[PDB]
């Protein structure tokens, strides 16, 4: 018989005892490395089972023979006789399961190929499926257009659920369930699904409700049958709970509506509520990276493209257009097909009040919140928005309101008359009403501070100069303190300058001064005079590069993306946190595993970057791929081979261990032979706790050179790897490197954590002292003042970075300012004579 159907029958056995993640054979052509290797990171044996039974089921039928007949039968004899029996004999139960599944595929014809099974939702569904009471019901909801039909089909094909239901499954799409005859025909069709016979004499057309309750009674009385004890009625896209109030026939029914109104009525205890608008429900874009594989079947072209989160309808139709240009059909195309479906579900709204107000909403930015007053101007209004929230459209929250981008931009921007005049004159009028004697308005944090810029650029220029307060000074205080930032304020300052050049140059100087950094605000405005900021500060009083934060504990591990643009920041509350240097756009807040206190390392270019904690381990990761790659636990300071051709990850454990491994391979290559260690070009310097250095040979590994530091009473290389430093009690000693033998001491407090840079022999001591250009003098004290105590600084090549305070606030400074401006002065100890003042 078939050899692709018998496997799902023993999915129970697989989950019970089988784990395909102990494989060390995996004969390559058996299955692509990516598929089986992403099952290695499966959450549990159930997840591994599902991943295997989906990926393998995607393969062609004859290859499963190589999977089973010989690869599985290495020496097994154990559970292949049942599989082969099912292939040949096939039990009646299994045969009916296969027949029913084939019938379903033969009914849909589109889910058989265009299915990419989402493990998380099915995983969260099938446990409730297997425990469903013979008359309990299950509700699935969320946001419409999420391919919930596909999820229902995914859970439907499961062998376990079909066995539990005894293949008593009936699918009814609840489209247009808002008329008595529309549900009457569904009653007849479901009856005929159960049995195409009817004692239609009781049909009395005097009341269609009479006949509907009669047929409901008939269906109830027939459903109470031994073959009908377990039946699964699928209710696709339930219109309203009113329809269910007739379709409530006391069975194991699963309904998947697409309206927010329907889910509220049903009780969670009575109906296990399931929503699809969740991060877990949303899985990963890697789930939908195979969409072009299910549609176009082109693996290499997936990398050039970029998939998004779980939006099966929109994303699927965009890909269908793409396969029939990737970029042309991404946005410009689908304006006639994706829109058709996006406002196809809308059509239930009456347009006199609902659609008109929704069109009014178009003026607001695509992803923006909204005050209640503003929507009121454009309790009848709140009742209207509340019922709109009830149907499907608007999300409500405590007391502003957010609107999804799917319905806000594409559906209504294309079809929009010019009501923008009234909307934008109101958007001008309300902030004018939001004016005071001072410049402190009751602005709302989200909508006001963000979109006052949009609206004032929209109306005219004099309003632009006045109410942004860049002519004034109150914006700089209010926005920044209330936004805790500077990136958003800059993003307002830049594109809005189009709405006079004399003031445009002044506000350009303002914009330049903005990233450079009550009484404090006026004092700093006093510095700039050609700008009217101090001019406004006078009325107010009569009446460093950039910055970071985003964290919860204490600044650890300051770094630099080699290619001018990223920071592998990281903090102490286990969370990731990576950021741009000229944007600070938080790019990945990913808890590795142990955010504690130790170190991070890069590679020659990129593609690996894990930071060891205080649990020995030094787990590694990718770049924008992020997901941690290497788990390594045996351990301290280890560096990559400085040669770009040899990817040799030189490793250093305790007890002066030398493990060496190419990253391209998974096993240590060389395992030859305690505070901090280093390699050389044949020599090994290690320092340990007695504060006397130890120097060994790579080849003989004994004691040859001991630097006791001679003044007892951390090692790092330079811009030529030629200058190792030994830190001992109170000394820095430039140790050699298979070229010479000892260079410099420079008569240096206990050295907390002193490191090197990446150039010109200069190395960094931090914040006890400053930049000492070894081989000897000190140049700078991190070169851009203090602004408290800690503020890091280094040079990868010619750009600089370094992020780690202690007070959650790291700072990127640069060489150019130099000369330690305000702090290099006469210290706390001074006496004053009020002469001026001789101090």
């Amino acid at each position: 018989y078939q050899y692709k159907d018998i496997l799902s029958v023993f999915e129970d056995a697989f989950v019970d005892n089988f784990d395909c993640k102990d494989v060390q054979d995996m004969p390559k052509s058996i299955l692509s490395k990516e598929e089986i290797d992403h099952i290695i990171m499966s959450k549990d044996a159930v997840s591994g089972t599902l991943r295997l039974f989906w990926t393998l089921l995607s393969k062609q039928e004859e290859m499963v023979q190589k999977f089973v007949e010989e690869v599985l039968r290495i020496n097994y004899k154990f559970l292949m006789s049942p599989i082969k029996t099912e292939q040949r004999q096939p039990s009646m139960m299994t045969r009916m399961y296969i027949e029913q599944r084939d019938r379903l595929y033969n009914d849909n014809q589109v889910f058989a190929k265009y299915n990419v099974s989402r493990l998380q939702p099915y995983l969260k569904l099938r446990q409730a499926l297997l425990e469903l009471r013979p008359a309990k019901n299950v509700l699935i909801d969320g946001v419409l257009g999420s391919g919930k039909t596909w999820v229902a089909l995914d859970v439907c094909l499961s062998y376990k659920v079909q066995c539990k239901m005894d293949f008593k499954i009936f699918w009814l799409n609840l489209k247009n369930c808002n008329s008595p005859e529309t549900v009457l025909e569904m009653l007849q069709k479901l009856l005929y699904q159960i049995d195409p016979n009817w004692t239609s004499r009781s049909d009395h057309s005097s009341n269609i409700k009479l006949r509907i309750h009669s047929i409901q009674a008939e269906l109830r009385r027939l459903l109470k049958s031994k073959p009908y004890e377990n039946c699964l009625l699928v209710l696709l896209n339930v219109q309203n709970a009113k329809a269910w109030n007739a379709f409530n026939l006391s069975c194991k029914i699963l309904l998947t509506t697409r309206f927010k109104q329907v889910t509220d009525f049903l009780s969670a205890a009575t109906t296990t509520h399931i929503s699809l608008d969740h991060h877990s429900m949303t899985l990963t874009p890697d789930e939908v990276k195979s969409l072009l594989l299910k549609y176009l079947d082109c693996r290499p072209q997936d990398l050039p493209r970029e998939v998004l989160t779980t939006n099966p309808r929109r994303l699927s139709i965009i890909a269908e257009s793409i396969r029939d240009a990737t970029w042309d059909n991404w946005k410009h195309v689908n304006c006639d097909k994706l829109t058709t479906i996006i406002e196809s579900s809308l059509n239930v709204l009456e347009p006199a009040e609902y659609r008109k107000m929704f069109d009014r909403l178009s003026v607001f930015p695509p992803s923006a919140h909204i005050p209640t007053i503003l929507l009121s101007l454009i309790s009848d209004v709140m009742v209207v928005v509340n019922k709109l929230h009830k149907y499907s459209l608007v999300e409500k929250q405590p007391s502003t309101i957010s609107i999804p981008s799917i319905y806000l931009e594409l559906k209504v921007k294309l079809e929009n008359e010019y009501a923008l005049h009234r909307s934008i004159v109101d958007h001008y009028n309300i902030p004018k009403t939001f004016d005071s004697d001072d410049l402190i308005p009751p602005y709302l944090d989200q909508y006001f501070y963000s979109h006052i810029g949009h609206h004032l650029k929209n109306i005219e220029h004099p309003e632009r100069m006045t109410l942004f307060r860049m002519v004034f000074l109150d914006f700089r205080f209010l926005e920044q303190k209330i936004r805790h930032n500077t990136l958003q304020q800059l993003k307002f300052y830049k594109p809005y300058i189009c709405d006079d050049p004399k003031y445009e140059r002044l506000v350009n100087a303002i914009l330049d001064f903005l990233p450079k950094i009550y009484t404090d605000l006026l004092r700093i405005a006093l510095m700039a005079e050609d700008e009217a900021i101090f001019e406004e500060a006078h009325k107010q009083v009569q009446r460093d590069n950039e910055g970071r934060h985003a964290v919860y504990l204490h600044n650890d591990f300051c770094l630099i993306a080699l290619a001018s643009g990223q920071i592998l920041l990281t903090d102490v509350s286990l969370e990731g946190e990576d950021t741009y240097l000229l944007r600070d756009e938080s790019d990945s807040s990913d808890i590795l595993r142990m955010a504690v206190f130790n170190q991070q390392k890069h590679l020659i270019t990129l593609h690996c970057n894990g930071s060891v904690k205080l649990w020995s381990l030094w787990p590694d990761c990718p770049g924008r791929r992020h997901s941690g790659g290497s788990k390594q636990q045996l351990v301290k300071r280890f560096i990559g081979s400085y040669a770009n051709l040899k990817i040799v990850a030189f490793y250093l454990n305790e007890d002066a261990g030398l493990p060496e491994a190419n990253i391209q391979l998974h096993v240590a290559f060389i395992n030859g032979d305690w505070d901090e260690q280093d390699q050389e070009f044949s020599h090994v310097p290690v320092l340990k706790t007695m504060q006397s250095g130890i120097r060994c040979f790579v080849q003989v590994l004994k004691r040859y050179y001991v630097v006791c530091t001679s003044n007892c009473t951390l090692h790092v290389f330079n811009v030529e790897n030629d200058t190792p430093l030994a830190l001992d009690v109170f000394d820095e000693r430039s140790k050699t490197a298979t070229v010479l033998l000892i260079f410099k001491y420079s008569v240096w407090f206990l050295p907390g954590l002193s490191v090197s840079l990446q150039s010109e022999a200069v190395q960094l001591p931090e914040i006890t002292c400053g930049k000492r250009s070894t081989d000897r003098y000190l140049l700078l004290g991190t070169s851009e003042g203090l602004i408290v105590y800690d503020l890091k600084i280094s040079d990868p090549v010619l750009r600089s970075n370094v992020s780690e305070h202690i007070e959650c606030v790291d700072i990127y400074e640069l060489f150019d300012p130099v000369y330690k401006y305000i702090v290099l002065c006469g210290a706390k100890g001074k006496q004053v004579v009020h002469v001026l003042r001789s101090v």
């Binding site: 697989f14 019970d16 005892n17 089988f18 784990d19 395909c20 993640k21 102990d22 494989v23 060390q24 054979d25 690869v71 599985l72 039968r73 290495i74 020496n75 097994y76 004899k77 154990f78 649990w615 020995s616 381990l617 788990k631 636990q633 045996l634």
Partner: protein, 102 residues
């Protein structure tokens, strides 16, 4: 197999983990016809962080990872486990397994 074999195996795990050699058992059971391409070791691999505590006592859990697996199959496996210990020749554990039955 019934829950009696489950409880017997979980109780005598700490004893049969040491009487019978781990390698001599696993390398005798992989050919015995239980642990193959679909099962193989599932014990030489772990949660991923066992190195917090030293290898000498690590072995004690690795072999502990074996027996707890052997219980998960059907009624045959228990008696097959009998047969497995017959290959082990550490029959003082085989008779201990026998004592719970018969």
């Amino acid at each position: 197999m019934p829950k009696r074999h489950r409880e017997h195996i979980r109780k005598n795990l700490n004893i049969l983990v040491e009487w019978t050699n781990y390698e001599r058992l696993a390398m005798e059971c992989v050919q015995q016809g239980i642990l193959t391409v679909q099962m193989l070791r599932n014990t030489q691999d772990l949660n991923g962080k066992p190195f917090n505590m030293d290898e000498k006592d690590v072995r004690v859990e690795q072999h502990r990872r074996l027996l707890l697996k052997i219980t998960q199959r059907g009624p045959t496996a228990y008696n097959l486990l009998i047969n497995a210990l017959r290959n082990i020749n550490c029959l003082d554990a085989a008779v201990l397994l026998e004592s719970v039955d018969e």
